[PDB]
């Protein structure tokens with residue numbers, strides 16, 4: 001496994017799915033719910049086949065949280081960061097579409113960070129591809145402390161977004177475990 | 190051969206009533222429990238009427254100023270949790286319902302949320318009050334109760350099996366529907382055809398039938414329901430007839446396209462039915478058919494029925510047509 | 519046809535084991551991104567080795583979190599006896615690669631037994647996963663657990679057939695989900 005310099009990592013959870021998930025008998029003890037998650041995750045997996053998102057690399061789904069990165073196909077400079085944002089606005093469109101056909105109101109909660117990672121396989125039995133390093137930890141923490149319908153970024157990530165035409169607003173301070181207090185920003189539309 | 194049928198429609202459309210008719214028709218302490226619910230129907234129905242009299246524009250007046258004291262009695266007890274139902278209640282209730290002003294307010298019920306089983310129970314208070322009271326089949330059909338969740342009712346007709354699924358029509362409840370979209374024989378979509386003059390509960394602004402129309406387009410055009418055909422239960426035809434013949438609230442004053450509408454040549458009016466009702470009942474149908482016609486592409490079909498859920502003499506007849514249609518799926 | 523095919527099957531009498539590292543963040547500060555990821559992969563390789571012998575099918579490595587149900591792919595009578603002995607091994611496994619690293623860290627193991635759905639979601643980057651309230655409980659059991667100890671439920675004892683020296687766990691004291699769902703938890707010796 002090899003290391004990287006400028007990899008933009010993103011988490012997108014649907015925190016309002018956990019409530020929706022019930023286990024009855026009518027719903028086959030929770031299957032009919034998964035059937036929906038599938039329909040959504042598959043719609044989210046389908047976006048990667050778009051040319052504009054050819055540089056996007058889905059890493060995994062965690063529970064009902066979509067995790068993707070850009071700049072893994074590396075050796076403007078921060079074009080991929082602004083593509084990850086472009087990508088998260090897209091998931092919101094798929095989710096908005098599902099909502100129509102599912103008589104539901106699912107919102108997406110996005111955290112986006114960039115920085116150095118390490119990428120490679122893990123585990124002896126079934127080697128699977130994953131990306132570590134503080135960059136991701138922070139990305140994860142900016143999802144979980146996020147806000148619905150909003151994208152939550154770190155300061156320097158906001159800096160980049162401004163140098164790409166994105167307007168921003170400061171949330172204030174988040175406490176990341178092991179990295180302490182730190183200033184975060186929502187992206188505006 | 191099993192058939193899984195999903196019942197869909199807005200709030201207070203008929204869904205529950207129809208499940209009930211399947212029990213009357215194709216199934217077999219049990220009713221003593223349902224008595225309490227009917228009394229609640231009676232309570233919630235009388236308060237709602239009087240409460241609404243003073244909030245209407247113009248406000249309504251009691252024909253008998255004496256009744257003001259019962260009006261006071263009802264509003265005083267409106268919130269009471271485990272209401273005792275003392276014989277006063279029925280006395281005061283009846284008295285109010287006799288007051289022509291209370292009734293005149295009841296005519297204007299299209300302007301506030303009043304349950305369908307009002308006039309039915311308010312006409313039979315003296316029967317319900319007796320402590321040896323036992324509800325008639327029509328009483329059980331008429332008892333309104335909100336459905337929260339999904340309820341599976343299994344029955345059989347001629348060794349052929351049916352699984353029926355009941356869902357909440359209220360907006361908050363529609364989010365559960367999806368759970369019944371996979372492996373489904375056919376949609377039964379219920380509409381309160383008579384609710385053309387009244388707004389919905391959830392926002393107190395959006396017209397009930399228009400809500401029903403939009404809900405149908407949602408289902409008819411759903412991405413997970415392009416195979417599945419929909420049996421359309423245009424329901425509450427009695428109440429529809431009433432309104433058209435009563436002539437108080439015109440349809441064209443809610444759905445202006447009605448003025449620019451003549452009656453279909455393919456129409457088969459029930460024996461000696463009024464040309465006006467005929468026109469009206471089939472117009473509501475065609476409004477729904479436009480949605481079904483537009484898209485679809487021979488993969489699923491729309492089968493309409495004029496329905497009265499509270500009339501078992503019409504449920505059997507139309508459910509029979511549905512057994513027939515289920516031949517190919 | 520109209521729904522995507524779901525690659526998911528229902529499975530009762532299975533036992534779910536979540537395992538987290540206590541004080542992972544302290545380690546994360548003591549060594550470079552390089553060493554951490556190497557030590558991590560070196561540990562979960564050992565874990566995977568122990569897993570297959572203890573008849574537990576490994577599911578996913580989530581950062582510092584490991585989970586591996588027993589009773590899959592085909593049912594087992596000792597499906598809960600496996601996990602217990604599997605968890606037993608992880609406490610020893612970690613101990614060897616604990617004092618050799620310098621800073622003391624430990625494994626926190628939680629276990630539950632019940633029905634699960636399992637399989638895969640979406641279309642891209644498939645990873646075998648599990649879902650159920652029993653899995654949700656499983657994960658919370660780990661959350662409300664103790665270092666170097668193995669947290670088990672009332673259910674994962676109604677399967678143990680009284681073979682391990684148990685004792686009251688007080689999971690309501692460490693985790694709200696446990697308390698609010700009123701779960702009787704225990705620990706082993």
Ligand SMILES: Nc1nc2c(ncn2[C@@H]2O[C@H](COP(=O)(O)OP(=O)(O)OP(O)(O)=S)[C@@H](O)[C@H]2O)c(=O)[nH]1
Pocket residue numbers: 198199200201202203204205206207305306330331332333334335336356357358359424425426427428496497498499500
């Ligand atoms: N007069 C008349 N009343 C009807 C007719 N169909 C249904 N009703 C009454 O309207 C009320 C509303 O229908 P009901 O079945 O109770 O709710 P629903 O349509 O299933 O809607 P929900 O329970 O999911 S919220 C019932 O009390 C029923 O008695 C009809 O054809 N004629």
Ligand SMILES: C=C[C@@]1(C)CC(=O)[C@]2(O)[C@@]3(C)[C@@H](O)CCC(C)(C)[C@@H]3[C@H](O)[C@H](OC(C)=O)[C@@]2(C)O1
Pocket residue numbers: 013014017018021037062063064065647648649650651653654657
């Ligand atoms: C998918 C539905 C549901 C309810 C079922 C389930 O068991 C989970 O997938 C687990 C517990 C489960 O899959 C095991 C891993 C992990 C990561 C612990 C999941 C998340 O906590 C999910 O919550 C999230 C964030 O969606 C959760 C709880 O969601």
Ligand SMILES: [Ca+2]
Pocket residue numbers: 538539540541542543582
């Ligand atoms: Ca940890």
Ligand SMILES: [Cl-]
Pocket residue numbers: 198199200201202379380381382384397398401
């Ligand atoms: Cl309706």
Ligand SMILES: [Mg+2]
Pocket residue numbers: 203204205206334335336355356357358
């Ligand atoms: Mg109902």
